[PDB]
Design a binder for this molecule. Structure first.
Ligand SMILES: Nc1ncnc2c1ncn2[C@@H]1O[C@H](COP(=O)(O)OP(=O)(O)O)[C@@H](O)[C@H]1O
Ligand SMILES: Nc1ncnc2c1ncn2[C@@H]1O[C@H](COP(=O)(O)OP(=O)(O)O)[C@@H](O)[C@H]1O
Ligand SMILES: Nc1ncnc2c1ncn2[C@@H]1O[C@H](CO)[C@@H](O)[C@H]1O
Ligand SMILES: Nc1ncnc2c1ncn2[C@@H]1O[C@H](CO)[C@@H](O)[C@H]1O
Ligand SMILES: [K+]
Ligand SMILES: [K+]
Lengths: 330, 330
């Protein structure tokens, strides 16, 4: 038996969420639909201009772990918070979902990471992230026994921003592969790919990463192309399995020369797209670690992702296992 | 001119919100639909049993102030938080709504109040409140110029729980009445009325309170009766104006022998009833301080309350002024 189906590793963040008008993004020089890194001074400034907000536990990988647990899989998470009230919220929410989470805070300062997420009327989300205690995640936070005992270890491209997180990921890759497990990553954000293009390709080509998740813009950015077909051909050459999401157009799963296209589910409306890709990865990785076909992994991903975009907050509040059962994915 | 339409005073609280099944309330001996006071130990215990949650600024009077500001009125608030992350969230949200909020935290311990609110499938809410820093609210927190310059000062019956808050309220009553203003209270919760029945009646009969808000159960509890008609007759005798809410059956406004019945909005589904009474008071007090008829005040209260019960969280995230305009309440 294995203790875990999916271990995820990422920046532990609490989301601060508010709807805004289109002009707010322009006035504040926020890049729409992207992850904008900010310092402490900028965080205070944007917060002072932000309307009344809702808080919810976030973090890309955190959301993915939570989603796997929600669907019925056994998940674990590595990510560093501070010993503060935001850190206590993060710790509560992930553990309450039944994700193994044991990363120890190193003190109260830097404080727990937070992201101010502005949701426009079209449902797009523009994130503004102060990394705080995330800068302290390092090799010391690798629970080797967990990596040793997880079918898949999945991490964020976003980990390349903080200084030492990459060292932890290399340790995970080694331990995972020594125990015959598989490694996975998400490209995270198109600008993040702009920052770490060469390093990400190296992870894939050296075999440190087996399964890669990308959205359309991330895939395009990885190869600096406007040709989506080229991006699909190249990503298939660079990793063993690629899952490329296409928003309302669903997803395509690639393995060697195999291609499996999956449709998006029907939705009421796009309330808030925050978490879409994260939950696609939840459903995909849940199906994968249950031995399901790649097409069925894509279907489970589309189901979970389509549910999360119909609610405020990045982690489904409803039962994904019940939704999977009703959709006959079971 | 007056600087303020409505000043409100209450327990400054951050809500921690989760849905639960019916059995959860029974297993944890939580009184359904009520405000359950808890100590720090019980707070830790219930949190450990609570599922993944969302946080939103709460506090009955805080919500009411926010509601007034959202409708287009000029609002102020007194309530005490701690110098901690929860306190910073509370301070941000109320000020971001355009409510004057200047009460100074006194330190980091006790920490900012929080309420674990469990929402059942019927939309009912069951609150479990650790008062924290709310116990420090006292006469030192009365900004006398604000009370002098507010058309109505409104406070919670809930303030009778912490030790010194009532002294601040009596100071407010004096100042308000010396400046020709009006005083208002909500009975807050049926058990709260059970605890402070004699004192609440004294506030009304001595003329410290001019305008009283009650729901059906609070009114019944006030006179320890099962006869709703008796309760209406008695509450009308005991205060100048009474606004009595009846959930799906709307409300009734009483003044002397005058009675004004107002219909509730037809609701597709009750998502979360948290905030209903608070936002009824927003709309009523907004209308009242705009010189509207008592019926129209009731209509505005019903419109705001109906909006807040159709969303998760106790402060409407949509424009109440726009809704009022569409409804021809303007
Ligand atoms: N408008 C939409 N309608 C239906 N499903 C959607 C929509 N947008 C996203 N999804 C679902 O979320 C998945 C990931 O969305 P995408 O926007 O590509 O991800 P990311 O969050 O990584 O940008 C899609 O494969 C799809 O299943
Ligand atoms: N099921 C419902 N349908 C429509 N309106 C409702 C419903 N429940 C509450 N309301 C609105 O909220 C107001 C106050 O609700 P009530 O349940 O009496 O308040 P409280 O929050 O004080 O218990 C009502 O007067 C009505 O306008
Ligand atoms: N730099 C970051 N690293 C990891 N996750 C992030 C970052 N910035 C924002 N997020 C998270 O991305 C999620 C949506 O994919 C949000 O829940 C938010 O917390
Ligand atoms: N003891 C209390 N005093 C004042 N407000 C409270 C109390 N307990 C819970 N609340 C608030 O009541 C609101 C709903 O009326 C919630 O937003 C919650 O914060
Ligand atoms: K969402
Ligand atoms: K609500």
């Amino acid at each position: 038996m294995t203790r875990f189906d999916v271990l995820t590793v990422g920046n532990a963040i609490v989301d601060i969420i508010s709807r805004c008008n289109d002009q707010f993004l322009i006035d504040n020089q926020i890049t729409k639909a992207a992850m904008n890194l900010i310092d402490a001074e900028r965080a205070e400034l944007l917060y002072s201009r932000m309307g009344p907000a809702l808080e919810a536990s976030g973090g890309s990988a955190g959301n993915t772990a939570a989603g796997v647990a929600n669907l019925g899989g056994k998940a674990a998470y590595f990510g560093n918070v501070a010993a503060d009230q935001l850190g206590d919220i993060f710790t509560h929410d992930i553990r309450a979902q039944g994700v193994h989470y044991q990363t120890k805070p190193k003190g109260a300062f830097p404080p727990t990471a937070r992201s101010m997420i502005f949701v426009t009327e079209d449902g797009e989300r523009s994130m503004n992230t102060y990394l705080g205690a995330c800068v302290e995640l390092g090799p010391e936070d690798v629970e080797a026994d967990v990596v040793a005992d997880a079918k898949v270890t999945y991490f964020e491209g976003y980990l390349w921003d903080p200084p030492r997180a990459k060292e932890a990921i290399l340790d995970c890759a080694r331990i995972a592969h020594q125990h015959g497990r598989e490694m996975s990553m998400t490209l995270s954000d198109s600008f993040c790919v702009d920052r770490y293009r060469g390093e990400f390709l190296d992870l894939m080509r050296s075999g440190k990463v087996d399964i890669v998740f990308a959205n359309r813009q991330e895939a395009l950015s990885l190869y600096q192309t406007d040709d989506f077909e080229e991006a699909l051909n190249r990503i298939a050459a660079d990793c063993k399995i690629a899952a490329v999401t296409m928003s309302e157009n669903g997803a395509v799963i690639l393995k060697g020369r195999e291609r499996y296209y999956v449709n998006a589910i029907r939705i009421r409306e796009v309330v808030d797209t925050t978490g879409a890709g994260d939950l696609f990865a939840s459903g995909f990785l849940y199906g994968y670690t249950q031995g399901r076909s790649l097409e069925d992994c894509g279907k489970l991903g589309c189901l979970a992702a389509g549910i999360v975009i119909q609610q405020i907050g990045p982690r489904p509040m409803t039962s994904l296992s019940e939704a999977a059962k009703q959709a006959g994915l079971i």
